[PDB]
Amino acid sequence: SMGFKVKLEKRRNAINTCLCIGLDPDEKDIENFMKNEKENNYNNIKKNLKEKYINNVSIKKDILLKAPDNIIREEKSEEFFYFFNHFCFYIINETNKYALTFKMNFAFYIPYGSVGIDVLKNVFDYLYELNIPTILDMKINDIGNTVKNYRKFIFEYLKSDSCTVNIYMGTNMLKDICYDEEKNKYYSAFVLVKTTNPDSAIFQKNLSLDNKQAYVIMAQEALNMSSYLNLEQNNEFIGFVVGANSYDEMNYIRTYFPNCYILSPGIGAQNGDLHKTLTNGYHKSYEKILINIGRAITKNPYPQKAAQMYYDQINAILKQNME
Amino acid sequence: SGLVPRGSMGFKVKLEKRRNAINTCLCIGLDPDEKDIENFMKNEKENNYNNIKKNLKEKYINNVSIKKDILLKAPDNIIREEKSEEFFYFFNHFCFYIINETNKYALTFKMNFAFYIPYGSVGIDVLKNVFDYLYELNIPTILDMKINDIGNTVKNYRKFIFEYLKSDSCTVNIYMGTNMLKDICYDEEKNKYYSAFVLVKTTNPDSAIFQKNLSLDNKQAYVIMAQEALNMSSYLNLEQNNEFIGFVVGANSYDEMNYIRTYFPNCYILSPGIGAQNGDLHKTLTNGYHKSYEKILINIGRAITKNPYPQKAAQMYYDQINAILKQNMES
């Protein structure tokens, strides 16, 4: 019942970081988990089985609760489901004490068909039980009638706190993403502003209007719609995705939108500079500058230590900025 | 087989061969909503499962991948013996019904992913059986998902769309950058090439705010984006491999349709917005006209799927399109 602004602030006060852990498991990660767990006699899956909230997931709980040794031989058709889900629970278990937010990119959960969407639901239920803020990164975009399906999937089925949105088609789509008039519900989102891909300048910087580059125009229009929807008063927000390799744009966005929520991917695997990113994007309410780190944690041999490393680096920078 | 392929190689070829046989550019959209599924279940109960019994006599239902056993059951037996499969069964049967009733008028079918996800996994199973079913019927397919991400991420969508569903094409939003197309329309590790349509001008009422108002070098953003897409298609050598990158241009965007067809004469256009939305068929098809009709796909979803007589609705659009194609050929 509390809005996302309030939930995020409360979590930030409890754990004192702005680390956002990205959970994007690829086929190799799942294969590697099954191989490593076969070698270490299922050390991590055995730990997963001891956690309280595994008893609360809603999809194929009985399969997940089985011993790894029983699955491989007598439930071959559930093997991929089992190891995929257990990899996700392992990462969450190892790293959640350091996380302000988890962000799950939908692309990683769909390419096997339905099975990965069951895993995704179980992941969102598990995070909900742990009371950890969630972002579903799906970069959704469509006309209003179609996009309402994503509002349902993301905010009703998964019970996500927030999602990502590409508003290139227009900003009117957000009326059917961030607001449900019949249910009188408000939801939060981050819109794409400046992205990490190497050619991101080709439309985001080269296109312009009124002496302002497209990324600035798009950030303004997203805030105009947030204001139209009265999201702030309802404890929700529309924020911006700004790449952690995009230092000038991060500085421009925080300078011209000093109150905005920013989500910043690109540190670690994509080699963004954490110091410049967090400094340029800084806000004393530092839930407003989420630093997403995916592969540098999930592909590290010791994800707890990887998360700790980034938690420590971030906190040192926040301390410097708090002066 | 290790021998040279004998079947169609490439979406361009698949589209042209079907267009030659059925003489239309109608694209039937299959976007079933919760009400559609509800209604089908209710109507079928009331007509003693007329349409599901028809579905069960079609041969290719025997070739779908997922829970075929369940789909082949008699509907009354589903209700009493497989109650937890009821929604899956009626959702998948509504789709087969629409496909059976309308496919003979369709150059291609476009399925919008959004309608298949909001129930969790169950709808993705339906989506896969739908693509399996259309594959068997050898009807060209489009998965409309407007995908976009960085390269490492988007490869997952390439896998889902082109390897798992075996779609012929998809829709893509290239606002993040054109280079994403290298990981969608091409697979370097397999030397495979796939087709896409990129968003150029969309039907939502505020579409001008970025697509028209933003500019570079005396060109509106939609022109910039179209050109970048075409440049990437050339770089990837798609057309030499019988694939293409085309454009989504809304059926209510007449000036832009004219511009696009004029300045990109041989491009593939996909145009939604007629029927349920405010598009005008005559104006759209006239501005986007190409003698290779398959380069101007006219998508109609709700005006067919929400019609109580879908075959006749499809026939009427097919007939109208053919009359307009005739006027534009010069009878």
Ligand SMILES: Nc1c(F)c(=O)[nH]c(=O)n1[C@@H]1O[C@H](COP(=O)(O)O)[C@@H](O)[C@H]1O
């Ligand atoms: N949402 C994104 C953007 F808008 C963007 O400009 N760049 C991104 O990387 N992501 C996502 O952020 C994550 C980066 O993960 P990691 O590199 O493993 O740390 C992936 O989910 C990406 O798809």
Ligand SMILES: Nc1c(F)c(=O)[nH]c(=O)n1[C@@H]1O[C@H](COP(=O)(O)O)[C@@H](O)[C@H]1O
């Ligand atoms: N892909 C689209 C565009 F880029 C666009 O500008 N406008 C659209 O309507 N669609 C899709 O086209 C279909 C319109 O369906 P119908 O109105 O029922 O005939 C839906 O799937 C829409 O999401």
